[PDB]
Amino acid sequence: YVPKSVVINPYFEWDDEDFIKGKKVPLKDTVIYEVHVKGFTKLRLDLPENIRGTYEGLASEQMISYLKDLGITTVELMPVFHFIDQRFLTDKGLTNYWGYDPINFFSPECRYSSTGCLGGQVLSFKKMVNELHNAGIEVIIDVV
Amino acid sequence: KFLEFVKKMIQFYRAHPAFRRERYFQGKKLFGMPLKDVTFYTLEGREVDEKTWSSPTQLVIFVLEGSVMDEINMYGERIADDSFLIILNANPNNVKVKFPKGKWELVISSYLREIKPEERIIEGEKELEIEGRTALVYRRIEL
Amino acid sequence: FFRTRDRPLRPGDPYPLGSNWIEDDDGVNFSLFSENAEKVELLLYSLTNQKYPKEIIEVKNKTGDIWHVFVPGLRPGQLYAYRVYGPYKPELGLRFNPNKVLIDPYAKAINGSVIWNDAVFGYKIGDQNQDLTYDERDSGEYVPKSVVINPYFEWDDEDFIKGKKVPLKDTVIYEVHVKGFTKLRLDLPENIRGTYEGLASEQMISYLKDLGITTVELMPVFHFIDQRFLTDKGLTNYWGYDPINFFSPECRYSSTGCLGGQVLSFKKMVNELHNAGIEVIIDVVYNHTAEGNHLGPTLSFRGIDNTAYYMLQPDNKRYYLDFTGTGNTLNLSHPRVIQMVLDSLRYWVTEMHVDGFRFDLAAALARELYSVNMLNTFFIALQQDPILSQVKLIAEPWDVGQGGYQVGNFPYQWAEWNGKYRDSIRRFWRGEALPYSEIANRLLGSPDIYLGNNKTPFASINYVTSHDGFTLEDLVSYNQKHNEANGFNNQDGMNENYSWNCGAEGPTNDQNVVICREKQKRNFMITLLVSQGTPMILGGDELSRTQRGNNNAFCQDNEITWFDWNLDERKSKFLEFVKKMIQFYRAHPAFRRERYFQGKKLFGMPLKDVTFYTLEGREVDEKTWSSPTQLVIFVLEGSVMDEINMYGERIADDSFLIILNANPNNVKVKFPKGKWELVISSYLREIKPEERIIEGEKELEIEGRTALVYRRIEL
Amino acid sequence: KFLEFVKKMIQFYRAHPAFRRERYFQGKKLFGMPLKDVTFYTLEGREVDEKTWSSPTQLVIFVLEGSVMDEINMYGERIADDSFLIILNANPNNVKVKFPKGKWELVISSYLREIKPEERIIEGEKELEIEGRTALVYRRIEL
Amino acid sequence: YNHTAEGNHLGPTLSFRGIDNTAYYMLQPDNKRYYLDFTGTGNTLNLSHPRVIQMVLDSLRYWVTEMHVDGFRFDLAAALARELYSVNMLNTFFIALQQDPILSQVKLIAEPWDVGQGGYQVGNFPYQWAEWNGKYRDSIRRF
Ligand SMILES: *[C@@H]1O[C@H](CO)[C@@H](O[C@H]2O[C@H](C)[C@@H](N[C@H]3CC(CO)[C@@H](O)[C@H](O)[C@H]3O)[C@H](O)[C@H]2O)[C@H](O)[C@H]1O
Numbered sequence A: 001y002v003p004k005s006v007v008i009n010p011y012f013e014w015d016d017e018d019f020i021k022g023k024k025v026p027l028k029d030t031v032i033y034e035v036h037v038k039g040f041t042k043l044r045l046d047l048p049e050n051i052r053g054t055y056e057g058l059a060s061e062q063m064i065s066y067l068k069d070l071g072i073t074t075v076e077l078m079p080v081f082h083f084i085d086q087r088f089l090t091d092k093g094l095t096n097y098w099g100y101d102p103i104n105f106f107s108p109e110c111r112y113s114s115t116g117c118l119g120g121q122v123l124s125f126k127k128m129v130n131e132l133h134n135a136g137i138e139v140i141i142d143v144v
Numbered sequence B, D: 001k002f003l004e005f006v007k008k009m010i011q012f013y014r015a016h017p018a019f020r021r022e023r024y025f026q027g028k029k030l031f032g033m034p035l036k037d038v039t040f041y042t043l044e045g046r047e048v049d050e051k052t053w054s055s056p057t058q059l060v061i062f063v064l065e066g067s068v069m070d071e072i073n074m075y076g077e078r079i080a081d082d083s084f085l086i087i088l089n090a091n092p093n094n095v096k097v098k099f100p101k102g103k104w105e106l107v108i109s110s111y112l113r114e115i116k117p118e119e120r121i122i123e124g125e126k127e128l129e130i131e132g133r134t135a136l137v138y139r140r141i142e143l
Numbered sequence C: 001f002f003r004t005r006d007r008p009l010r011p012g013d014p015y016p017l018g019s020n021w022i023e024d025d026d027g028v029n030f031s032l033f034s035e036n037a038e039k040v041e042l043l044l045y046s047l048t049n050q051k052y053p054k055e056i057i058e059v060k061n062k063t064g065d066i067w068h069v070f071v072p073g074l075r076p077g078q079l080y081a082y083r084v085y086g087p088y089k090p091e092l093g094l095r096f097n098p099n100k101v102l103i104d105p106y107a108k109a110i111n112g113s114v115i116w117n118d119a120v121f122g123y124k125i126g127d128q129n130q131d132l133t134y135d136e137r138d139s140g141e142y143v144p145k146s147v148v149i150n151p152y153f154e155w156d157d158e159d160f161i162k163g164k165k166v167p168l169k170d171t172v173i174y175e176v177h178v179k180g181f182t183k184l185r186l187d188l189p190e191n192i193r194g195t196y197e198g199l200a201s202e203q204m205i206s207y208l209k210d211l212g213i214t215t216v217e218l219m220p221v222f223h224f225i226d227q228r229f230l231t232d233k234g235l236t237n238y239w240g241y242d243p244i245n246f247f248s249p250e251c252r253y254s255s256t257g258c259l260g261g262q263v264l265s266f267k268k269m270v271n272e273l274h275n276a277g278i279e280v281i282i283d284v285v286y287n288h289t290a291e292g293n294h295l296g297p298t299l300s301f302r303g304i305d306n307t308a309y310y311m312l313q314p315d316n317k318r319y320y321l322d323f324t325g326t327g328n329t330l331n332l333s334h335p336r337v338i339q340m341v342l343d344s345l346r347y348w349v350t351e352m353h354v355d356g357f358r359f360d361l362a363a364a365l366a367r368e369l370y371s372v373n374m375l376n377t378f379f380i381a382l383q384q385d386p387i388l389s390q391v392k393l394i395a396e397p398w399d400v401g402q403g404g405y406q407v408g409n410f411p412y413q414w415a416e417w418n419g420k421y422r423d424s425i426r427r428f429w430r431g432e433a434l435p436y437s438e439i440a441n442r443l444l445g446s447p448d449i450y451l452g453n454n455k456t457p458f459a460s461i462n463y464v465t466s467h468d469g470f471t472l473e474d475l476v477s478y479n480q481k482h483n484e485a486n487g488f489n490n491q492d493g494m495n496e497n498y499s500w501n502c503g504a505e506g507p508t509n510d511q512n513v514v515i516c517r518e519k520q521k522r523n524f525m526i527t528l529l530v531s532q533g534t535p536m537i538l539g540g541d542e543l544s545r546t547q548r549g550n551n552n553a554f555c556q557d558n559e560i561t562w563f564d565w566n567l568d569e570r571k572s573k574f575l576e577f578v579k580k581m582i583q584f585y586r587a588h589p590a591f592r593r594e595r596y597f598q599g600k601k602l603f604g605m606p607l608k609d610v611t612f613y614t615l616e617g618r619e620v621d622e623k624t625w626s627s628p629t630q631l632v633i634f635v636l637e638g639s640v641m642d643e644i645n646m647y648g649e650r651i652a653d654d655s656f657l658i659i660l661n662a663n664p665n666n667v668k669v670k671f672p673k674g675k676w677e678l679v680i681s682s683y684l685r686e687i688k689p690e691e692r693i694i695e696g697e698k699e700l701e702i703e704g705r706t707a708l709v710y711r712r713i714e715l
Numbered sequence E: 001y002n003h004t005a006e007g008n009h010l011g012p013t014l015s016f017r018g019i020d021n022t023a024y025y026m027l028q029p030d031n032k033r034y035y036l037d038f039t040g041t042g043n044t045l046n047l048s049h050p051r052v053i054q055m056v057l058d059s060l061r062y063w064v065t066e067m068h069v070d071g072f073r074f075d076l077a078a079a080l081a082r083e084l085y086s087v088n089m090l091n092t093f094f095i096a097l098q099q100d101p102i103l104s105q106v107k108l109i110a111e112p113w114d115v116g117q118g119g120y121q122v123g124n125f126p127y128q129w130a131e132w133n134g135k136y137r138d139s140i141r142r143f
């Protein structure tokens, strides 16, 4: 019944990475944009389904362009620590949508990964941050 | 049409240092200028006093002196902006505010209606009516 | 209700000109020259909506005569265009129309083309005071938008070809139309047919590698517009010789299109070519624009700053000096225009990795006000430039204006198109008898033309055919020009085509005719590829390409100009001939020379490096040399050449004997001493077993219209 | 002593953006501020009128308004400085000068003697004796 | 760049005079045995020749990319604009220099004149060009 832990290959090429590292958004000109990875883009038929409401969906041209337009500088994602659906929510045909119930502190929630679930959640995440930084956008994660 | 409003508001915030500050406003004149970096007025035309400052209200009105700011960048330059006049009216009814000296082009508001052609400037300490639940920002273009 | 200053901005930089994705400051830097404008507006558009500005920024900073702004948040891909305000006074040259949306003359990508519409003209069209009037219809929705780009491209295998490449001296040029090349090549999947990507495909790369050419000269690939008068005829600008921007590659050749993908699609093509050991020379139009004269549209330069850019009637300044014959001529005297042209050249060199340029209507670049000057500013700057001093420069040595015939007059480092060569050689085989001189000279790299200026046979670009005029097929397939499909009542195209039908006009069945044509084709081909200098093949003549006697198919974007790859016996058996001829030229130094032949014995040898004989067996004399002829015959002494390589070795070849007979009738030539195996000819028939050697000063009969090369294997 | 002085003076130049300008002072106010970025005065308070701008002079005096300059760094920030009051008496004799309104502080002069304590701070349109061949820079601490 | 140590005629023959005398030096157009002297040092380099112009520009680029100099102050800069007999500030040399990728980024200061006739060229210099202000020098001295 309990999911299994996955050993991973931590190698990821942060192309264009390193330069944003560097006189970025100071707190003083920052404008924060609190987003739910899924809710962001679930109903965005603008993208092909199956990246709707995932990381990959969040860091797409379409979306990146939106945020760039909107004019926000940093995005604060809701909890992305792998979390569980409380039973009392399950027994009601319900789910933990917000995610504020972490079970592990190092793994990104699998239910947002387009690639899933086996190692692809962390790969899918890194690309998203990479993609964002390339666009001059900070990332702040809600942390439980 | 609101999306458009949030976009333009954000751009406003970003284009203006007098709102992205690393230091607080004190209530005084700095650098030997004849103005305050900030000033809180009453509903006519009047700097706030110890009593009006403690007593409640639904109408806030305040002036930020772009030029007399104590904001320094990382290169040791001080950092002028423009002088603004923010008029916040939460009063359910309308009110009549008296503008402080100088001349005051309109920039932004709550009004969803065609901005009356007599609201787009204010001169000479004269005054103007403001529908309840309304926010207005003004830019002094001459003092 | 905001201001131009409630939007986050920076003052930006005057340099470079154009728009620059500055990764580090997450924004774009917009630079635009104009010394006459009173105000400038940056117009930002979006993918979807292109009828109106998404946003309007006013360029408020200006260092000297250069307005500059930096908008945060803009990245690559962002569409933009320019409004320019200023004085409108067509009497004085001032033609500012801020209603007219303009293209950034420094754009490296341009979105669509122009949707033709009166509103793009900035005078009232139907008005009686044409071009004196001031039309104030917004034209945004019709003019394509400039695209900001990401210049990063990984030139894999790039850097090494950079490096002892094709010297002008062993070069063999192949003039091609990117589209026409490969439109009718079902060998590739469609949608790269007639694009860059199509040009640099395995299939094609292998073709060129086979054919044996070393460098390819692409027709104009500067983003260009279709003249309205061509549009209003259901027609197109197929050739492209009407540029509107000097930095952007034409979108109509990009497979990826059109948004940034034209320049990406181009770079890959050059990359792909270099990997195959192939140079790239682009046809370049710098002498005129697509804005034509007055009455013409207002798209780019006319709006931004008309006083510059454009040569104006100095007494009027309302009309345009036109030495190009296309309505206007670029003011190559204004510092900013000289910079733009030069930038463009450097841009296409260091950025797009071009290897050389063929300048169209060169002379137009050496114009001051009414006079030609091969020593104008522009040329001298071009000559001292560290980057450009290294690339191949080739010239159409003439413009159309008065006194614009500049053959032999271009500064060193320039090769010029030899129009003497083409005309003469064409009239020689035709049948005409020219003085033995006028042809021997041609055959020897036109020393008379170029040796008076310290140039070498390199500088002479020899060619029989070209995009201008007939094809090689239609050069032996016609006497007059059949350009009725152009829709100018056949009132365009050169009248003198120095051509001949071989006794007809158009396609034929008469075998005696076809045979003639097939012969001549090989007479031409033997010549070009045996004359000193640098030979140019017209792309397709190895396919016997036909334009149905259209000698001016500039607007024919169709089957008329399409490459036809369907090869029967005849068409293909010739392909084989061009291949073997080219290989011959390449395998033999005695034809790829850095020095001219003098007429003497060198290095203490008993022979001449060259020798011109008569019809029997006899060195030419002062009189026979000046008197006409239709039979040229000459010996090149491989061994007694003054050719040194870069390592200081002199360079033997074999001794040849070229016999050119343009005489319509047969003749009997007496072979000079020694023994003379046959190699190549015009004969389509089984080579007679008594023609395959000649000994002992004896003699042989030669059918008229026939070329023969011989190799002395014993003396 | 001179070496030292040149040092201190170069250090001053480079401290204050009002002198390392990228654009020219205009003769007028700016950014809707009362004070004008640059002003010239005469012996007495009255601003340099017309014929006084043409007629010769052995005495120059002018006030730079650091807080109302049209100066923008490469980041789109208006710069500001201090407000300074230059006195250039090239005249060989002494002269009395009337400071403009504010309250001023002595920053540097060409005086080799110790500066009298009543030159260190001028106030309220007050007057000051200026020896001939003497140059003085002043900062307005209050207004 | 404006003149050589080979003086006029009667001068020595060391370098240019000897390599090409019709190329490097502005010769009296009526004589060509005498040297046009706009510098006062015997001779004048003629930056109207394609190879002369190339050498000066080569040199400039050499000291920049090779010696990592940050800019030049040209001595008698005006004599560099003499092309024919007069100062054309629109000459080939200056134009090539303006459009040059490398020299485009460096500093270019000028002695804005020469000893020549009508050589005084204060303020007429191309942009990015700065000028030694001779009028300042004098005015301030006299003040
Ligand atoms: C060298 O440069 C030439 C001019 O740019 C090229 O010209 C060829 O293409 C031109 C568009 C064409 N223009 C004229 C056509 C006609 C009638 O035939 C008129 O109606 C137009 O107004 C003219 O502009 C030239 O005739 C044609 O030769 C040349 O191909 C390049 O190699």
Ligand SMILES: *[C@@H]1O[C@H](CO)[C@@H](O[C@H]2O[C@H](C)[C@@H](N[C@H]3CC(CO)[C@@H](O)[C@H](O)[C@H]3O)[C@H](O)[C@H]2O)[C@H](O)[C@H]1O
Binding pocket: E003, E039, E040, E041, E042, E075, E076
């Ligand atoms: C600018 O350029 C000037 C000339 O190159 C410089 O000139 C200074 O040095 C020169 C060598 C000197 N030459 C003359 C001296 C005299 C008499 O004093 C004559 O006998 C010579 O024949 C002259 O050539 C100049 O007088 C001197 O000012 C200047 O310093 C540079 O800034």
Ligand SMILES: OC[C@H]1O[C@H](O)[C@H](O)[C@@H](O)[C@@H]1O
Binding pocket: C398, C399, C400, C401, C405, C419
């Ligand atoms: O004026 C234009 C003409 O100039 C020269 O005569 C060229 O040789 C010719 O080909 C061209 O058409």
Ligand SMILES: OC[C@H]1O[C@H](O)[C@H](O)[C@@H](O)[C@@H]1O
Binding pocket: C405, C420
């Ligand atoms: O003006 C054009 C003519 O100039 C010269 O006479 C050339 O020799 C000739 O070939 C050319 O057609």
Ligand SMILES: OC[C@H]1O[C@H](O)[C@H](O)[C@@H](O)[C@@H]1O
Binding pocket: E113, E114, E115, E116, E134
């Ligand atoms: O001709 C050269 C002279 O020109 C001017 O008179 C300058 O003021 C002077 O300093 C310079 O030496």
Ligand SMILES: OC[C@H]1O[C@H](O)[C@H](O)[C@@H](O)[C@@H]1O
Binding pocket: E120
């Ligand atoms: O002798 C020096 C003077 O020479 C000329 O007259 C100049 O025009 C002048 O500005 C300069 O002061």
